[PDB]
Amino acid sequence: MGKRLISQNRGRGTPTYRAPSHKYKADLRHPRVDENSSLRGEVVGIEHDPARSAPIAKVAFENGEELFLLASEGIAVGNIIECGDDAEVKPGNIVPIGNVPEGFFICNVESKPNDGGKFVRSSGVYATVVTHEATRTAVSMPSGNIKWLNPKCRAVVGIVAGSGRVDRPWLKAGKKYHKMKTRAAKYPRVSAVAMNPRDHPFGGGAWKHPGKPTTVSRNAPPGRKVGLIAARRTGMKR
RNA sequence: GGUGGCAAUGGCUAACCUUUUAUCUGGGCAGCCGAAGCGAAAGCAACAUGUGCGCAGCCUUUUGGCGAGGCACGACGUAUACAAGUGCGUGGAGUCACCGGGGUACGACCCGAAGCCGGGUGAUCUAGGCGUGGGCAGGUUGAAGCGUGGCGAAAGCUACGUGGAGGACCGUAAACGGUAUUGAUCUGCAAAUCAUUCGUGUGACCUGCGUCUCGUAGUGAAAUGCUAAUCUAACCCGGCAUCCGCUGGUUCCUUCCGAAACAUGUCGCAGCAUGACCUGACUUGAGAUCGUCGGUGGAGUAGAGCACUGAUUGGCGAUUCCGGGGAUCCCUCGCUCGCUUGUCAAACUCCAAACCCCCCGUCAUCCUAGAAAGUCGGAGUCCGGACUGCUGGGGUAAGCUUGUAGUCCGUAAGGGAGACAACCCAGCCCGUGGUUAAGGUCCCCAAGUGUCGACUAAGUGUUAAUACUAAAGGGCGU
RNA sequence: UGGGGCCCCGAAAAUUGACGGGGCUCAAGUCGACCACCGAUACCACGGAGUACCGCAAGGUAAUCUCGUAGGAAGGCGUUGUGUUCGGGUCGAAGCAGGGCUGUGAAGUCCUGUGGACCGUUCACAAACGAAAAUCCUGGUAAUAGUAGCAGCAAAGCAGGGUGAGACUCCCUGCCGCCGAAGGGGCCAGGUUUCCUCGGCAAUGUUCGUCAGCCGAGGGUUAGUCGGUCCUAAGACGUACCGUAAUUCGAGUACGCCGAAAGGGAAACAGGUUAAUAUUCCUGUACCAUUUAGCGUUUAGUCUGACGUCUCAGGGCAAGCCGAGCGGCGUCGUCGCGCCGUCUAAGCAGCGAACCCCGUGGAGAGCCGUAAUGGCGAGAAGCGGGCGAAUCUGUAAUGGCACAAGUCGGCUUCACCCCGGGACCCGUGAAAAGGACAGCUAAAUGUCCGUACCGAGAACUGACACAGGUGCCCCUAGCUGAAAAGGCUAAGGCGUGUCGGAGUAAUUCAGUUAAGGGAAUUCGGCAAAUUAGCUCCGUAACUUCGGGAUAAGGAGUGCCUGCUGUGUAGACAGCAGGUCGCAGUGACCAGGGGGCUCUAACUGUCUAAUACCAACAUAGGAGAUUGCAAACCCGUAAGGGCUAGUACAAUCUCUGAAUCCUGCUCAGUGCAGGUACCUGAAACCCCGGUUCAACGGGAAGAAGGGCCUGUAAACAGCGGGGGUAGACCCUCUUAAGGUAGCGUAGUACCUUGUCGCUUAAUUGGCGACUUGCAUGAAUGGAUCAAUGAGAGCCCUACUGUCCCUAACUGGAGUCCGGUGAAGCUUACAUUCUAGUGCACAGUCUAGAGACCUCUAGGGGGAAGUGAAGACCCCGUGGAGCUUUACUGCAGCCUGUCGUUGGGUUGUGGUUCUGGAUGUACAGUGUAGGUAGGAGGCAUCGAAGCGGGUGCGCCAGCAUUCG
RNA sequence: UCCUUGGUGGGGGCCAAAAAUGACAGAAAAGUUACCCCGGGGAUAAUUGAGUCGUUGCCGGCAAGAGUACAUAUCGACCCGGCAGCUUGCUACCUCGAUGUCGGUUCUUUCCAUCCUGGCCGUGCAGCAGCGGCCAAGGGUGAGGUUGUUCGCCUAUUAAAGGAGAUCGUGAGCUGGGUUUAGACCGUCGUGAGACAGGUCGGUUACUAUCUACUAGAGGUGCCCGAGGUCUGCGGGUAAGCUGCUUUUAGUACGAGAGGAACCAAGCAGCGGCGCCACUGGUGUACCGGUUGUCUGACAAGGCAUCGCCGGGCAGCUACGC
């Protein structure tokens, strides 16, 4: 058994690959709202989220529950966040995407209604509402894909705060090191061609090279799915 | 195999019972082997002796007779199914022991690895992740920002001060690291230390304690590094007395005999099997051939020769033929074929030995105190080496390599060569006396300063074989 | 002239050597012959042993018997026990040491001594039955050897006096030393009695020892306040649930519970006391918590606990320093200096800086602030108030002090306390207990565990009284000085980094110095030397504009006298004059510098114990997958990692900063998509077979494959020969044929390629050329400032690297006292030469030498010692790793069955009503299925007709609306 | 023939024929290891040693001829015969329970096939100087640049700057540049792991001497009236010297000139050897002085910092001196 790969080590769940969950502020999700209900809350603070490197808003709701929300750009302390099917479609409000006009920017979008918000959550990203239909509503993802969602899926109106985070180059291994201390990701990473053959499919050889094509089949088993996985194509576009 | 019991109307019992404490006595016929074979099977199913030779033994007129066992036939059962031949079997000897040998399987004469696998142990070291603490002498540089001021029509450009940034600089024997001396040390202070010299020293920093991640797993800024002095799969115990054709060892005496280092097959080439060769026993019963001489046969090697096959040298004579040289092919001529000359042959032969081989006779030797033959028990051995020949083959040669005959060493003393595995005498029980062998006789050193006839002037030489000994060539040296 | 013998020339090798040596000349050589002798275990003779065969035995025969490895065969000896026979022994068994005799021998027996209770023997039978060997095992014990070590990193002792049997070594005094930002002080983990006292010295202590962490005996640890205990952290554990064949196994969830002697945290101090404990005992003066009783009660949910890195202001203060008084000690050749002390806890009470807040105020052709950033009509300055620190003041003030003084001032202040500001983050820097906000008075209670001592050059760990590590973890006085560097000194700890003496060789470890030369040394400037602090002047190529940079290169520097400036001060900066030395950063400390290349951008990481590199990483660049019930990955499952995450995200790869760029090739392999057609298993279905099945075919046809398309920042590739001043048409092209660049390279075989600079001379370096054996673009190309314990070359400086060594210093060595190992070893051994021999001999052969013992010395030889060669081969020995090797197994893709139901239609017959609808030729009539080969109905029904209801040749059977 | 019996379908068997194992007396079968491990082997290679000598180095015989003529002053074809073992091969006898690699360095020694120095002979030798050969191994044979080199090239001296053997002498002497481990890069090869007889950067050199040998120093015993002194010399050893330059002979002999010697004589030098310390230089931790920092209160006198550092230096030792 030429040793297991880094991906298999991470799947094992060892401490080297686990997130420092105790360092994080909140499991960001929409407040739980019953069918045909609404809740209002006011923003009391804007805090740094170590798990995302983007601000989060602390919201005190009418029901006596205090919750951390994924902050949209422009959300300010003292703002009244409304969440409901009848809520005004305004930045920071959590409304169903069936009530959002075409061309509006949404974020923290539920995969299914009441899911808590799955898509469009990183700093600066946003989704655009494209079409409305009777049972489906379509949005353009930050990836460019068109996603057909239930119109009852809730989303906060606006874009995610923290835009331009990666415009500043790391410039230095130490800065990225400090970012990686709060993440599960292993830093730094050794290239596979630099490893021995017992440690990677690409390892070994008198000189550094994979020895086999780096595009691997989608059928390849664990310990073998390395390099370009099921690549449609390779190279820079001609 | 040796020794016994019983014996075709066979032998022996197993478990078990009888124990009155393992014995023992008496039972115990289940079963096994023998008693019928042949055939895949269905199936079918044989001599209580028909003949001959003949050992022992007995008889005998000493040459014969009878002749168990033995040998050779004949006959029969069955398969080959058609036949014909043949195979196997058939005229009652087995069975159970004791004491041995040997094969096979088991740890299998004893010890000797790396490994493979199971279940467990380990992160007091080290690597990485996390929690919570601690630390970084003293200096240097002087980013943005800010203040005031200069040069400008503006655009803008610019000085100083302030400021205190940076995986910034120097630097500590703080801490961490570990360059070079290839210094000390190298049975050390030390199973990695010491001195000097070095790198980092506000950061991807160093570090305490806590905590987590581990064996086909972990950890790794990746060297197969690290995971408790252990890492290209840790450690403990277990599988395990693993296995090996490979290495080492294997313990008292005498006596008798005494090899093979070879062939064929083998994933065979450091092994094994079968055979040759050694050893033991038995059966059988009259010849055998290591040697000679003569004869009947085989020769195709040596040598020789050119008659075949091919090579090979000139001279001489012809092919009015096939062809090289500058229109009557106007005339010049190489091969080709013969008669003489000169040479050859592993794979040429008109010839043709000496050795040798088969057979017959002969002498010789061995043999009833057991020829030849047969059956069975136990092996070792299949790394060889040498000398003398074979101009052995190959090779420039080789103390090379690979054959062959004889003989040796191996496994061979003693005597002699200076010593000498295998060269000479000699194969050797113990003791004594004698005479020789090889070799030697000036001394070392037993026996010749021996004899005759010559040679050598070079200390040549004083060297059987010899892996241990110099040639071609020359000399009015003698 | 030819043929012969012997000799000569031809004829050169390595330690001194070989006719065996001496030597030998009408021979002691050679040749031809001869004579006598010596000389084996051979041969002969005698005697003896065994063997083979024969013989009833007695014995007979052997010229034709007597070597022997592997090996076969026969007979014996011995050990221990059993059955059995017969014995011996305290008048002395076994065993042991030595000896006599017998036997070929294995062995047996006897004698002497020693020993003190058991031992044999016949015939048989057994076995844990015989040792010289296994780098055999266990024990014991040599040589080495009175040898190495008791030196190197901290060179430490001497005098006098004691104690004692004994004194370098134990005690005291003095002198001389060591550490003095650690070798002192405090304490964690760890140790576990080592602590203290007395008594000892066999061992331990690297010597001694009267000493001791050693030995023996006794003693020693006192808590409401110090810790643990309490809280929670990362993270464990338990129960339950669920999984698992099962569990002591497994993730998650729920509930609990643990997890910090360096995080959070209720509260105590000073002095004294012991031999050893002391915030613990005692004195004095305090404080906290709970329970109870009385006196009163919510403000309730907030705050606190509660937080990063860097930087800075203000205030305080332990330590430190200065002047005066007082009290001691030292010095006293002269002087009047130097040192020590001049004290004082918690608690209690009082004041309160900054920040913040409140009330006034009204500030701009601008004012107010700060070290700095700043602030302001959204209300500055100014003026009042509130809240609120460290610390300070008093009290505790009588305790300790030589009941000696004990009284004052000033300066500074880290490395500690308080307080406030600023900057940075793609990094955001814990939680919970507890506490505060309403408590006051009294009484009672405060259990449990630890507590000695070391905390390391002797108390831990590394086998050690170990130069390592743990821990330099946290602390540290004066001068110099930037300083916690280094040096010299306190306090404190030591002379135990536990052998001494002696002073005399070589050699050696580590240092000092060195004429003249100056890298000639060497692979190479390795090593050493040079420089060195601070101030000022001055500083190049190149550059990413940041730097290079301390570039380079120059000048100054001490002491004394008198001053100037800045500043609140501490101090800092500067000037003038005088002056000494070889030298003023005088010691200590403390860069040598420069030029041209290769390479990697850089800081960083690494082979713990031979590789600190150009390797790894890195930021940057690019590609790939995935919309989250995702991609990727772990698990047998239950369930998980990534993930408290969500495309400017995670994961998977490649390349490796910047700068200029990154060309052509999709034939092969890979990947992706498409699947027209081909291939493609099982099940279902159909056919045949089978009284049933097995079975043989057919149809249908998933994934996969063929096949087509895309894709190179996927793996990869980018070629041969000849006509033309070696370009250009063709080729060979079985995808294409090297673009930009670079080029003899870290790649270039030829090769020390050619030329130029560098040198006297350069297989060198650099530059150019380049026919590139075999360069080339993210298998990244070229290039590059800065950086580098990286690799080469050159210049300068420097030098013992060298010419060529010398002297000197300390430690070893040498010699003496004490202590005291280990490693090689079959034996013998004073060798040397040659030969021989398994061809590399101290031992063999022939010579030559050699009297023995001891000491010192460097290492010629002992093919010296260490290690069953790691190179090579062999083994039907392994291991890891690779793959289009063989064979499998996971994972994954897909068909079928089960889970698995209900409706709607579209596809096959399942099952059958109204008609028997059936008809070459002509029909009166439709075969009314083959037919009793002929024989029934009918006005109570049989037709020629409408689109002709079944149908059909607008005919005619069926009585039908007529 | 198929398990109680009969039958059917389907099986099993007997004899023969076909289908293949070519590694052909028959496994269904790819690599890699320098990260390697274990068992062995001198049964078998790298290295030293032995043998051999094709090859290598050095010669010889006959002399074909060339040499204005003339084989033999000089050169020496064809063929033929050798020596050495210093090149490379061949071989597998020794060694795999290890005989430590290359090159250099240091020190000692040997060979002669002689580079110089000494003596000779020939010449196509006037002299100078050559060319060829003979004897001769006493002495000498050096310094540098490149390269790890050996080898070779080059430089300037030099009388000349010979070659080879000693386990390719010499790692219990040194060094570690090269090769010959583990890391990494480039090129090439391979699908790959990995490889290369390319290149490149980096990469641990163990031991207390038992015996023997040698270098020196002692104690004995032998010899011997007892002792002492002075000698002798069997023997051992030596390189105790070797070699240049200049002057002179002499601008002479010789030679047409140009050029240009030799015997004898002198001095100096290089290297070597032995000794010495008046001189000179070094050292000189005796000693004297100056001075920095600090401590002992100051002065004075002292301690410490490498002898603190700096300057000077007698004796002694020493060479760079004699």
Ligand SMILES: [K+]
């Ligand atoms: K890994």
Ligand SMILES: [K+]
């Ligand atoms: K990487």
Ligand SMILES: [K+]
């Ligand atoms: K013929």
Ligand SMILES: [K+]
């Ligand atoms: K204590």
Ligand SMILES: [K+]
């Ligand atoms: K780049």
Ligand SMILES: [Mg+2]
């Ligand atoms: Mg793999």
Ligand SMILES: [Mg+2]
């Ligand atoms: Mg038939």
Ligand SMILES: [Mg+2]
């Ligand atoms: Mg400034």
Ligand SMILES: [Mg+2]
């Ligand atoms: Mg530094």
Ligand SMILES: [Mg+2]
């Ligand atoms: Mg086991």
Ligand SMILES: [Mg+2]
């Ligand atoms: Mg055998």
Ligand SMILES: [Mg+2]
């Ligand atoms: Mg012949």
Ligand SMILES: [Mg+2]
């Ligand atoms: Mg013979």
Ligand SMILES: [Mg+2]
């Ligand atoms: Mg043998």
Ligand SMILES: [Mg+2]
């Ligand atoms: Mg023999």
Ligand SMILES: [Mg+2]
């Ligand atoms: Mg003999």
